[PDB]
Design an enzyme around this catalytic site. Structure first.
Site, short mmCIF file in Angstrom:
data_model
loop_
_atom_site.label_atom_id
_atom_site.label_comp_id
_atom_site.label_asym_id
_atom_site.label_seq_id
_atom_site.Cartn_x
_atom_site.Cartn_y
_atom_site.Cartn_z
CD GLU A 13 -112.34 -60.66 -0.85
OE1 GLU A 13 -111.85 -59.90 -1.71
OE2 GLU A 13 -112.86 -61.76 -1.13
CB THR A 15 -104.09 -54.75 -1.08
OG1 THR A 15 -103.76 -54.61 0.30
CG2 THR A 15 -103.95 -53.42 -1.78
N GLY A 17 -107.39 -58.46 -4.35
CA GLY A 17 -108.33 -59.51 -4.74
C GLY A 17 -108.34 -60.61 -3.73
CG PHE A 76 -99.69 -71.28 3.35
CD1 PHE A 76 -100.88 -70.60 3.19
CD2 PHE A 76 -99.51 -72.01 4.51
CE1 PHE A 76 -101.88 -70.64 4.15
CE2 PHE A 76 -100.51 -72.07 5.44
CZ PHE A 76 -101.70 -71.41 5.27
CG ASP A 121 -101.39 -51.05 2.30
OD1 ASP A 121 -101.68 -50.33 3.30
OD2 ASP A 121 -102.17 -51.91 1.85
CD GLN A 125 -104.67 -56.20 9.11
OE1 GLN A 125 -103.80 -55.29 9.03
NE2 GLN A 125 -105.71 -56.02 9.91
CG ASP A 139 -98.99 -58.52 -0.53
OD1 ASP A 139 -98.66 -59.66 -0.97
OD2 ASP A 139 -100.17 -58.24 -0.19
N1 HH5 Z 1 -101.52 -67.37 4.92
C1 HH5 Z 1 -101.01 -66.40 4.14
N2 HH5 Z 1 -101.75 -65.25 3.97
C2 HH5 Z 1 -101.27 -64.31 3.17
I1 HH5 Z 1 -102.27 -62.48 3.04
C3 HH5 Z 1 -100.09 -64.52 2.51
N3 HH5 Z 1 -99.38 -63.74 1.59
C4 HH5 Z 1 -98.33 -64.49 1.30
N4 HH5 Z 1 -98.28 -65.69 1.97
C5 HH5 Z 1 -99.42 -65.73 2.71
N5 HH5 Z 1 -99.82 -66.70 3.56
#
Ligand code: HH5
EC number: 2.7.11.22
Length: 284
Positions: A13, A15, A17, A76, A121, A125, A139
């Site tokens: 989860e 910020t 969705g 990713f 923010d 995470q 973000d």
């Molecule tokens: N694994 C992972 N987790 C998030 I939260 C991410 N936001 C952008 N790339 C991302 N890769």
């Protein structure tokens, strides 16, 4: 099932969705796909962030608006800093790596701030790491475009005092809190409510006043009845961080946002004289 992605799986989860690991059906590439839980203004403004590329920013690959749903597609990465500090709790993250990560994060913030984009923010995470020793911020820009339990631990005091204006300094505050947490292996200000958050800051840094923070007493949620705590030495807060690291942290945690060091100035701080880029030990 998705009309453009396969092997969609939930990561967490976020910020805004659910966050999925997904494979692009056309290209085979693995991405982070963020479903925005529910506006035209947000779409153009977030779409500008597709242009905003830097080694220490997680690349916003696409904005997909289909079937009256909004998704953000990001590059990713395999681990976040929260998991990495949990995995490193017995030993701690080595100091050269802490210094490398803080340096890199400041380069990402300096880039975004130079382009008039704030995060607002930052938290462990949304700090993501790879096997080559990079760390990247995810973000940036979403809070300004968009407007379970929210983490308050990294929120700057002006936000907690109800200032409805933001500045670059909010991100420096957050990063200074993260810097302290990497060093001590404990969150610096783990508040469970807005007033507990505020009062944890006051009981470490002292209750602010008009001497150290001109204007504070006219803040929207400032109350003259706040208790008056004395300020602790950073030497007791973040041992065994050295003089240079404690001086830099002090400058990232000034109460008055206007007094807080900028990301560009922080990169010149003596703490980074000996910076390197080590290899992390990542268990994926
Ligand atoms: N694994 C992972 N987790 C998030 I939260 C991410 N936001 C952008 N790339 C991302 N890769």
């Amino acid at each position: 099932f998705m009309e453009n992605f396969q092997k969609v799986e939930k990561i967490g989860e976020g910020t805004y969705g659910v966050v999925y690991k997904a494979r692009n059906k056309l290209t085979g590439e693995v991405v982070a796909l963020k479903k925005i839980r529910l506006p035209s203004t947000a779409i153009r403004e977030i779409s500008l962030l597709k242009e905003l590329n830097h080694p220490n920013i997680v690349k916003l690959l696409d904005v997909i608006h289909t079937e009256n749903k909004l998704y953000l597609v990001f590059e990713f990465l395999h681990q976040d800093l929260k998991k990495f500090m949990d995995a490193s709790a017995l030993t701690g993250i080595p100091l050269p790596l802490i210094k490398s990560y803080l340096f890199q994060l400041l380069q990402g913030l300096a880039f975004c701030h130079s382009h008039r984009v704030l995060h607002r923010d930052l938290k462990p995470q949304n700090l993501l790491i790879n096997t080559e020793g990079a760390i990247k911020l995810a973000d940036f820009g979403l809070a300004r475009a968009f407007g379970e339990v929210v983490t308050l631990w990294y929120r700057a005091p002006e936000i907690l005092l109800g200032c409805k204006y933001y500045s670059t300094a909010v991100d420096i505050w957050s990063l200074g809190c993260i810097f302290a947490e990497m060093v001590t292996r404990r969150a610096l200000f783990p508040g469970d409510s807005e007033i507990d958050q505020l009062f944890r800051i006051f009981r470490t840094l002292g209750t602010p006043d008009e001497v150290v923070w001109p204007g504070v007493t006219s803040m929207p949620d400032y109350k003259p009845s706040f208790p008056k705590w004395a300020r602790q030495d950073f030497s007791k807060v973040v041992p065994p961080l050295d003089e240079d690291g404690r001086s830099l942290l002090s400058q990232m945690l000034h109460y008055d946002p206007n007094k807080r060091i900028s990301a560009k100035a922080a990169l010149a701080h003596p703490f980074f004289q000996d910076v390197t880029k080590p290899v992390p030990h990542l268990r994926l």
